[PDB]
Structure formats: C-alpha cells, structure tokens
C-alpha cells in the first residue's frame with residue numbers, strides 16, 4: 596500500500612478521534628500506537644465498550660481490512676461511529692500508513 600496516501604486518509608477520516616504516535620493522547624477514540632499484533636481493546640488507559648473488549652481477535656492486515664470496511668458490522672455494540680471506507684485500495688493504503696505509524 597501507499598503510505599503517504601494512507602496518511603492523508605488517516606488525517607481526513609480518523610485523526611478527529613485518534614492519534615498514532617507513541618505516548619499519544621486518547622481522544623474520542625484510543626491512541627493506536629502498538630496496534631498490530633495486539634488483541635482488541637488493549638490500549639492502556641482507554642475505557643472501551645464491552646464489545647470492543649470482548650471481540651477477541653488480533654489486529655493485523657486482514658482484520659483491519661474487514662473492520663475498516665464496516666466497523667459496526669465487525670464489532671456490533673462498538674461506540675466507534677464511523678461509516679467505514681468502501682474502496683479496497685483506500686483501506687490498503689490506510690492500513691500501510693497505520694502499519695508504519697503505529698510502530699515507529
């Protein structure tokens with residue numbers, strides 16, 4: 596995926612509710628640093644729904660591609676109110692940005 600295009604998607608559609616940087620602040624949604632390879636609902640110091648806490652999957656490319664297409668479908672009961680990203684290539688670019696940004 597294209598990381599720079601993914602960054603612009605992140606800023607436009609996600610940054611209102613999320614930061615990605617290490618030690619970044621929780622906002623409406625959790626800081627996302629360290630997301631990849633982690634269970635759902637584990638960002639330290641964020642108060643999640645039971646749904647997000649209990650989903651019981653591990654975040655990676657496959658699971659983020661599905662979630663970000665339709666969040667409430669993948670995690671019914673979620674308090675992330677976001678319609679989703681329809682285009683596969685947009686999700687892929689965003690996920691590539693996230694894979695870099697949330698690890699560095």
Ligand code: HEC
Nearest residue numbers: 608609612623624635636637638643644647673674675677
């Ligand atoms: C834009 C496309 C994005 C991306 C990539 C993410 N979000 Fe959100 N998000 C929000 C809230 C309140 C939560 C917690 C939900 C709950 O507890 O039920 C989330 C959660 C996530 C996750 C899961 C994190 C985990 O640790 O399991 C992920 C991967 C995620 N978000 C990515 C709130 C918002 C928004 C508020 C209006 C918006 C906009 C977005 N999120 C957008 C995005």
